[PDB]
Write a protein that binds this ligand. Structure first.
Ligand SMILES: CC[C@H]1CC(O)=C(C2=Nc3ccc(NS(C)(=O)=O)cc3S(=O)(=O)N2)C(=O)N1Cc1ccc(F)cc1
Length: 557
């Protein structure tokens, strides 16, 4: 069937949408070439609608069913609990979209009777009705990029009340099932250090290692009614309260399989018959469906000793090489299989023989040396987008601070240390907002983070070596430098000079601030200070951090 049907009605915004990078006093110190940076708006949605709207054909063979059977066998070992209204409300982001029924995110959060009562009736209606499609809102995301222009991505989501109900029935399942089903292949269990560790070990466990990433063209669109039914049958294998079983089935038929699409003004835009991007099961459903399809496609393509790493729709395979010709013909069969299962590629997959040339989760492996000169691997990426978005966040307050997300996830990198840390700590010092808790996203989940805990966070996710890393690869250095020339970002010798200031200013303040200066900026000085384990680092509660993915799942820890 068709992924989408359109009435002709326009996808509308809520407020005004800026496409031009906003400029303030701090902007120029980070980025000169302001015309290179832009944010997508709802005005480019018409182009996105064309792209993601196609007919899907699915041809399921024996490999497909075998893998599914294996997945169900493990899923049936899981016991998941029904969450209470209260517990589910505590999981709602403070900046989450208001309900059409008179209450908002903060009303839900502090458990007002108006919020709690409507959630109960939405739940009750879920138990009684397993057929009536549920209203969803379609919006256009505002994402910032650098020109190379991309049309906006679409977000489809049900009303707040339903989102809380999703959490009640499905929060435990989506948090626990994927690891049990997919084992070490499930990538959202991994912190950066563990992921690097796992990619490298996997690369080393192969006599002649070959690797490739598989980019599906618009994954959400390729997902069929079948895939959503299949993913529900997986959920139903769990030991579940009879109320959870009813709700899950109901949400599958009424929400996850499809439904009408309503713009922010209240007009009907059309109908969806594919994956909604703003439901709780978006991440887990895509991960299960991607894993199922790929594993089966490995059997069809007869890939020798393949280890898979899956994060939602992001997929990387590492296996034994049969030589460049056989690898090329293997990947075609893989691609044909995936295409038959309704997961065609965007770019054709290419086999890589160097681990560092492989991109997965927008990240590639690279190597540096620590204080002992001892080789250490870390994940990095092209810094073009993270810097473009930092530039935007230098001039505009945002609900999600991507700069912090990038520092947390890319702390060991050259560009996050010298540019991102230096720039933003400079900003926080001038405002005296070091103690101020900030919101960011890790694996789709929203986190309130105090910047002064960054040293303790980095020690736990990357290890101490992250504060010492030096002698970066020529290839990494070339990419970082090429980005700054393109963007008009000051050279890295200017950033070092600025870092000396930021460090001293932090040290002069003592307490947790001096701790930040000591660890985060030890690189900037020739006369190096010794970096021992942090006194109160093991105090921070880092549970929930790397259990599951929750992209568009409206989650807050
Ligand atoms: C700053 C971004 C950083 C952290 C991060 O949240 C992600 C991420 N990766 C994803 C990858 C794929 C999806 N696809 S989806 C929509 O769930 O089907 C969703 C996410 S996500 O929304 O859950 N977030 C991500 O890919 N990265 C890069 C990364 C990943 C692992 C790592 F160890 C280091 C950096």
């Amino acid at each position: 069937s068709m992924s989408y049907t359109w009435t002709g009605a326009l996808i509308t915004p809520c407020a005004a949408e800026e496409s031009k990078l906003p400029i303030n006093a701090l902007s120029n110190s980070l980025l000169r070439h302001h015309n290179m940076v832009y944010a997508t708006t709802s005005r480019s949605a018409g182009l996105r609608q064309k792209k993601v709207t196609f007919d899907r054909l699915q041809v399921l063979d024996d490999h497909y069913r075998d893998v599914l059977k294996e997945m169900k066998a493990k899923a049936s070992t899981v016991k998941a609990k029904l969450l209470s209204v209260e517990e589910a409300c505590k999981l709602t982001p403070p900046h989450s979209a208001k309900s059409k029924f008179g209450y908002g995110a903060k009303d839900v959060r502090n458990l007002s009777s108006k919020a709690v009562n409507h959630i109960h009736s939405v739940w009750k209606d879920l138990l009684e009705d397993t057929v009536t499609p549920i209203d969803t809102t379609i919006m256009a995301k505002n994402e910032v990029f650098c020109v190379q222009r991309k049309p906006a991505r679409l977000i489809v989501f049900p009303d707040l009340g339903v989102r809380v109900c999703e959490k009640m029935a499905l929060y435990d399942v989506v948090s626990t099932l994927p690891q049990v089903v997919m084992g070490s292949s499930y990538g959202f269990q991994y912190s950066p250090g563990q992921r690097v560790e796992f990619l490298v070990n996997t690369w080393k466990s192969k006599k002649n290692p070959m690797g490739f990433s598989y980019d599906t063209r618009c994954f959400d669109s390729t997902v069929t009614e079948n895939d959503i039914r299949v993913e529900e049958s997986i959920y139903q294998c769990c030991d579940l309260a009879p109320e959870a079983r009813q709700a899950i089935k109901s949400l599958t038929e009424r929400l996850y399989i499809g439904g009408p699409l309503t713009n922010s003004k209240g007009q009907n835009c059309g109908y969806r018959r594919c994956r909604a991007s703003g439901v709780l099961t978006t991440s887990c459903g895509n991960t299960l469906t991607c894993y199922l399809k790929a594993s089966a496609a490995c059997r069809a393509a007869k890939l020798q000793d393949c280890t898979m790493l899956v994060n939602g729709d992001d997929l990387v395979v590492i296996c034994e090489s049969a030589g460049t010709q056989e690898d090329a013909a293997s990947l075609r069969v893989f691609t044909e299989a995936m295409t038959r299962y309704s997961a065609p590629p965007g770019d054709p997959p290419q086999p890589e023989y160097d681990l560092e040339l492989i991109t997965s989760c927008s990240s590639n492996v690279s190597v540096a040396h620590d204080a002992s000169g001892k080789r250490v691997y870390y994940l990095t990426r092209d810094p073009t987008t993270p810097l473009a978005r930092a530039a935007w966040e230098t001039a505009r307050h945002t609900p999600v601070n991507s700069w912090l997300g990038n520092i947390i996830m890319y702390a060991p990198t050259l560009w996050a240390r010298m540019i991102l840390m230096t720039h933003f700590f400079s900003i926080l010092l001038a405002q005296e907002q070091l103690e101020k808790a900030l919101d960011c996203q890790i694996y789709g989940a929203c986190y309130s983070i105090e910047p002064l805990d960054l040293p303790q966070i980095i020690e736990r996710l990357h290890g101490l070596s992250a504060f010492s890393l030096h002698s970066y690869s020529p290839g990494e250095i070339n990419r970082v430098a090429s980005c700054l020339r393109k963007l008009g970002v000051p050279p890295l010798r200017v950033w070092r000079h600025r870092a000396r200031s930021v460090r001293a200013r932090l040290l002069s303040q003592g307490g947790r601030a001096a701790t930040c200066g000591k660890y985060l900026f030890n690189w900037a000085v020739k006369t190096k200070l010794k970096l021992t384990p942090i006194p109160a680092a093991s105090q921070l509660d880092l549970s929930g951090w790397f259990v599951a993915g929750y992209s568009g799942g409206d989650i807050y820890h």
